[PDB]
Amino acid sequence: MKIINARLRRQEALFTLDLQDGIIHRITAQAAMQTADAGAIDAQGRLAIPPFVEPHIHLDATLTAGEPEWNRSGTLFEGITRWSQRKASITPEDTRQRALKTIGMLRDFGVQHVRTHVDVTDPSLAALQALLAVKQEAADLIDLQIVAFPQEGIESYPNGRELMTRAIEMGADVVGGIPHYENTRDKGVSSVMFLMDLAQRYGRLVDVHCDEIDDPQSRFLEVLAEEARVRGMGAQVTASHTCAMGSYDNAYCSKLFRLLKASGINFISCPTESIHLQGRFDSWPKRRGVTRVAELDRAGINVCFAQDSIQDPWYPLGNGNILRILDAGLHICHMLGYDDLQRCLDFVTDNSARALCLGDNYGLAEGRPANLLILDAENDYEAVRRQARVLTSIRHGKVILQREVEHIRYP
Amino acid sequence: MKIINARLRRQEALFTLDLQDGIIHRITAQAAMQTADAGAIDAQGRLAIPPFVEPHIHLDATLTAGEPEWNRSGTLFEGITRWSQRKASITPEDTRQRALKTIGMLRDFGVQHVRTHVDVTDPSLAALQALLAVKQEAADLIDLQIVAFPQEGIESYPNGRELMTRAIEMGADVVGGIPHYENTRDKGVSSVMFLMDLAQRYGRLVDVHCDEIDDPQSRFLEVLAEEARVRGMGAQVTASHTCAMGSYDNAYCSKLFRLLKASGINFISCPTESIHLQGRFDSWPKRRGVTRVAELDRAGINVCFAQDSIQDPWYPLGNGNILRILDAGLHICHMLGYDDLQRCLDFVTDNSARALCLGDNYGLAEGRPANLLILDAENDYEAVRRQARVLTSIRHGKVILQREVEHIRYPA
Ligand SMILES: N[P@]1(=O)C=CNC(=O)N1
Ligand SMILES: N[P@]1(=O)C=CNC(=O)N1
Ligand SMILES: [Fe+2]
Ligand SMILES: [Fe+2]
Secondary structure, eight states, X not given: OEEEEEEETTOOSOEEEEEETTEEEEEEEOSSOOOOOSSSEEOTTOEEEOOEEEEEEOTTTTTOTTSSSOOSSOXXXXXXXXXXXXXXXXXXXXXXXXXXXXXXXXXXXXXXXEEEEEEOOSTTOHHHHHHHHHHHHTTTTOEEEEEEEOTTOSSSSTTHHHHHHHHHHHTOSEEOOOGGGSSSHHHXXXXXXXXXXXXXXXXXXXXXXXXXXXXXXXXXXXXXXXXHHHHTOGGGEEXXXXXXXXXXXXXXXXXXXXXHHHHOOEEEEOHHHHHHHTTXXXXXXXXXXXXXXXXXXXXXXXXXXXOBOSSSSSOSOOOSOHHHHHHHHHHHTTOOSHHHHHSGGGGGTHHHHHHTTOGGGSSSSTTSBOOEEEESSSSHHHHHHTTOOEEEEEETTEEEEEOOOOOOBOO | OEEEEEEOTTOOSEEEEEEETTEEEEEEEOSSOOOOOTTEEEOTTOEEEOOEXXXXXXXXXXXXXXXXXXXXXXXXXXXXXXXXXXXXXXXXXXXXXXXXXXXXXXXXXXXXXXXXXXXXXXXXXXXXXXXXXXXXXXXXXXXXXXXXXXXXXXXXXXXXXXXXXXXHHHTOSEEOOOGGGXXXXXXXXXXXXXXXXXXXXXXXXXXXXXXXXXXXXXXXXXXXXXHHHHTTOGGGEEXXXXXXXGGOOHHHXXXXXXXXXXXXXXXXXXXHHHHHHTTTXXXXXXXXXXXXXXXXXXXXXXXXXXXXOSSBTTBSOOOSOHHHHHHHHHHHTTOOSHHHHHTGGGGTTXXXXXXXXXGGGSSSOXXXXXXXXXXXXXXXXXXXXXXOOEEEEEETTEEEEEOOOOOOBOOO
16 A cells, blocks of 8 residues: 655655555655655645654543542543442453543544553453453554553552562563652652562563642652652653642752663653642642643653543543644643754654654664554644544554544635 | 524524524424425524634744744744844745635634734834735634734833834724833832733723743732733623733732733633643643633633634644644633533533624624534533534625535445
C-alpha cells in the first residue's frame, strides 16, 4: 500500500510512503503533488504522523462516573472514595466491556499506543485479569501497557506489598505507586524503595503517580529520581503528575532539576485532569496546580501529556481525543510561543513514545512498523489550532479507520 | 419550513418547530419520533438551540499575529506594544478582509451574534470605519455590535476623549474603556466617570475591559458598578475580564458582591485568553487569573464566556469555535459538577444574549426571529463533552449552513 502526497513533520515538501509486509518499506521525496490515486492513500498535502499515544489512562475506572454517587467536591480524595464504592462491584466482564468501549474512542482519535493503570488494591485482582486479556484481544487496535497501581496505597492497604508482587508476576509490565497517598511521609518513602526494588528485580518499567497534590512539601519525586539514578533505571522510569512541583519552593526546585536531569526519568502531565482536581484547597488566588512542563522541556527533560480519565470518579468528561488535551496543556503551562506551537505535536507523539520506551517500534522511518495517521492539517500549528481530524489510521500496514473530509454546504 | 424530532434544552420531549415569514410560528411537543415529509427537516432527535453568541472579540486585530513581531512574553502589555506597531499600517480594506474571514469562522461554528471591540486610539479611526461597514456587509450572517475601545487609554492617549466621542458620533453601539491601563489610579477612576457620562448621554451600551491584570489592588470594577447602579444603567453595562477579582482579598470581595448584585451589571470572562495572558508575573505556584465565574453565577449575577482573540497580538490560536472556550471555562473555573454540566450551554447562549441586550430578538419562543441551530448532541452535557458540531444553522428562517453527520468507517 502506498501513501502519496504526504507532509512529514517540520519539513516542507511531499513524500510517498511505501508500506509492505506490515513495515515501512520506502520513504521518497516527490517532485510535486501527484495525480489523485484511488488505489493509494492520497494525503493531498496533509500531514502523515506516527500514531497518537495515550501514556496515562485509567481503563479499569473508565465509564463509571456517578456510580453509585458523584464526586461532588471535584477532589482527588473524594474521587478515591467514590472509586472504592464502585470497586466493590467490579468484575472482569464489567472491566472488559467498559475498557473496550473507551479503547474504541481512543482508536477513533488515532491512538494506537496506550499505558493503562489498573488498581491492584483488590484481593481478587479482577480488573487486572480482564485488562491482561484485553491487551491480547485489542492488539488489532492498540499496543497496551499495564501499570500495577496500588490506588489505596502499598504500605497501609491490607497485603499491599503482596498484591503488587502478585500483579507483576501475573504480567503487568509496569510498576506503579502512590507515595503522596501513603498514610505518613516515612511510608511514602518506604513505598518508593519497595516499588523500585520490585521493578529492578523483574526488569520492569516504572510509572508512579507522584506528588499529585498541591502541598509544596510533597517531595517524593526526589526519592524516585534518585533511586532511578542509583540503579541506572532512568530511561525506564516515569513520574506522572508531579503537581506539587508546580508549588515547590523555587530554590529547592532549582536544585532538584540537577537530579531530575541526571536521573534521565520521564514526566507525564494530565492538564485537563489537574486543572479540575488541583487548586481545590485554595480560595483566591487559585493555583493552576500543573507541573512545570515548559521548564522541564527547556531543561532537556522528556515530558508529555495525557488524558488520565474518561468519564470516571475523578473526571466527568472525556472523548478520547488527545488533541483537546494538548490544547489545554499548552494554555495552562504557558507554551503558546511561536516555537512551542511549531513543534507541539512532540508532546502527544514522540515524547510519549519515549516515555513508553517504544523505540524502533514507533516512528516514520524505513524498516519500522507501518503504523501511522493521516491528519487533516499541514503542520503542528494548524493541527492544534483546528483540532485537526484523523482522516486515516493505518496499523500494521492495514487501514483500520477512515473518515471523510468535512465539507460544509452554504445554500 | 418545519423542523421535527428536535430536542430542547433541559427537556425530555421531542418537539416540532414551525418556522415562517422569518419568525418562529409554533413550538409543539410530539408524542414520539415522526417521519418527515417534503420540505421538512428531521432533527433526528438532536438538540435545537438559539445561535451561539460571541459577546467579546477583537475583529480589528484578528489574523495579525506575528506582524511585525511576536508577543514573546505572552503578556497583555507586550501584546499592546505589538498592536501599536501593527496599527501603523492598518487600513480600512485590510481590516475589512480580515474581519470578514474571522466572521466566516464564527459563522461556521454557529455564532450569529457578535460584539466586537475596535481600537479607537487611532487618529485615522480606520478600523472603526471598516467595521461600521462590515456590520452592514455581514448582516446576512451576523448581528454585529461595535465597541469604542480606547486601547491606549482615555486619559493617557492624545485626544483620547475626543476620539471616544467621534467614535460614538459615528455610531459605535457600545462604549468601552480600559481603567487598569490608565497611567495613574486617579485617571483610571476619571476615565470611568467619562465613559459612563458618554454612554448615558448618547444612550449607548457599556462594555469595559475592567481590571485585566493580576494586581489585587486593581479595583476599577467597584467604580464601574457603582456608576451603573447610581445611573440605573445596570442592564446596559458589562464588565469584561475582571481578572483581578480572581486575586481579590476575600473580605473585600464578599462586600463587593453586594454592590455587584445591586448594580445589575453583566460579566464576561475569556478563559483561554486569560489562562494565556494571566499568571505571567508569578513564579510558582502560578495563579489561574480568571474572574470568579462560578461564584458570580451562584450569586444570581449574569456571567458568560468569550473567545476574545483569534490569531492576534495577544493570542496565537483561535478558530471561531465557542464550544472549545466553554470547555476551557468549565475546567479553569471549577464548574464540572453534574448540575453545572446539565446547564453549561447557558454561558455561551442565553447569558451572552442578555449581556448584549438582545431581548425578544433572541431565544426559541413563538413570535421571535427564526434564528437557531441544530447541534450534533442531545443535551448540554454531550454538547460540551463531544464538542458537538453545528449540523445546521438557520437565520431569518433560511438555512445558511449545513453539515452532514460524521460517519467513521472501519474497513478492517
Ligand atoms: N487523578 P488520578 O490520576 C485518577 C485516579 N486515581 C488517582 O490517584 N489519581
Ligand atoms: N486580552 P485583550 O482582551 C485584547 C486586546 N486588548 C486588551 O486590552 N485586552
Ligand atoms: Fe492517573
Ligand atoms: Fe478583549
